[PDB]
Amino acid sequence: MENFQKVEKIGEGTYGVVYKARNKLTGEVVALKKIRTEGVPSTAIREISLLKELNHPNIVKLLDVIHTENKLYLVFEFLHQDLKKFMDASALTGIPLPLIKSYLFQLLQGLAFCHSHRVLHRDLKPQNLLINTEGAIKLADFGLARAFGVPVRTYTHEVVTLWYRAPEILLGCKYYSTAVDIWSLGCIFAEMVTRRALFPGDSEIDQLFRIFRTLGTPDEVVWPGVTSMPDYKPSFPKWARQDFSKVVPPLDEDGRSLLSQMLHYDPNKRISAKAALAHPFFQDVTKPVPHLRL
Ligand SMILES: Nc1nc(Nc2ccccc2)nc(-c2cc(Cl)ccc2O)n1
Numbered sequence: 001m002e003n004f005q006k007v008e009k010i011g012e013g014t015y016g017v018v019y020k021a022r023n024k025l026t027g028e029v030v031a032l033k034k035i036r037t038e039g040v041p042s043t044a045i046r047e048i049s050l051l052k053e054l055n056h057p058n059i060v061k062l063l064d065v066i067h068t069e070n071k072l073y074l075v076f077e078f079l080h081q082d083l084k085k086f087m088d089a090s091a092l093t094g095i096p097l098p099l100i101k102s103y104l105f106q107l108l109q110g111l112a113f114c115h116s117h118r119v120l121h122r123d124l125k126p127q128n129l130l131i132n133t134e135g136a137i138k139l140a141d142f143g144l145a146r147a148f149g150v151p152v153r154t155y156t157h158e159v160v161t162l163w164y165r166a167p168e169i170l171l172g173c174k175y176y177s178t179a180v181d182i183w184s185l186g187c188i189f190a191e192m193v194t195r196r197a198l199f200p201g202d203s204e205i206d207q208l209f210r211i212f213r214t215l216g217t218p219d220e221v222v223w224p225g226v227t228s229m230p231d232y233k234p235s236f237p238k239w240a241r242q243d244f245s246k247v248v249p250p251l252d253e254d255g256r257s258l259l260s261q262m263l264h265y266d267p268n269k270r271i272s273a274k275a276a277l278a279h280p281f282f283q284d285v286t287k288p289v290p291h292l293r294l
Pocket of ligand 1 (some may be wrong): 011012017031033077080081127128130141
């Protein structure tokens with residue numbers, strides 16, 4: 001748009017490309033996300049518009065929702081680096097535990113906030129998490145999947161990230177709950193710790209089986225109703241659960257304990273963001289300053 005003297009394309013999200021842009025007028029630097037056709041649903045514009053009211057220190061502010069030329073643009077406050085990039089840049093030394101802990105605590109605060117407002121993210125991933133020089137981390141792009149509905153293959157054909165998808169989604173559950181975000185966050189937490197994606201599935205079944213190989217194939221004991229899930233197949237191989245200390249070494253028992261609660265198979269047993277905030281793991285949480293190279 002002419003209102004912006006655009007800076008550049010900075011990434012591609014599940015629902016569209018994100019641009020860094022300068023509001024010529026105000027000179028404001030923002031993140032502009034172009035939503036991907038029919039002509040842009042009306043129910044969606046209303047629902048996404050409601051997200052403009054979301055105000056929380058750990059939620060990237062949605063400044064505007066612009067509908068034009070049969071195209072939807074979301075204008076977001078701009079943060080300089082996404083967690084994926086930070087993790088790649090910190091892959092040699094790892095993110096200090098205090099920072100990982102700070103980030104997780106803040107992320108849980110953001111989710112607790114959104115969930116308490118009946119807003120789910122549904123597609124949480126490192127690239128959706130933005131950090132700034134002052135130690136804050138924020139979640140961006142909530143409520144998009146619930147407003148537009150999950151795609152399948154971007155217009156530009158880009159490898160959709162399945163790594164953070166909760167098993168109930170993989171098993172074809174038509175109804176999502178706040179639990180899917182906790183699962184995604186658990187996966188991200190594990191990744192910050194180990195510096196490697198926890199469940200880097202190549203496909204939907206590989207994603208599911210990687211989960212099964214690590215957490216054990218779920219059954220009716222650990223997850224009542226799982227054998228009735230839409231995509232559940234009795235033919236699924238039955239893997240025994242792996243010793244959990246093997247999953248995120250060298251994370252201490254508090255962290256491993258919290259993580260195990262975030263990764264419970266049953267969305268109903270999975271810890272809530274609010275409950276997670278009270279976990280002993282955060283007893284000594286602080287807010288460290290990240291070494292950010294912008
Ligand atoms: N620094 C920075 N990088 C990126 N990269 C990125 C974008 C899309 C996919 C993957 C990475 N995205 C943002 C960003 C994104 C949104 Cl939604 C809202 C505000 C933002 O500041 N910011």
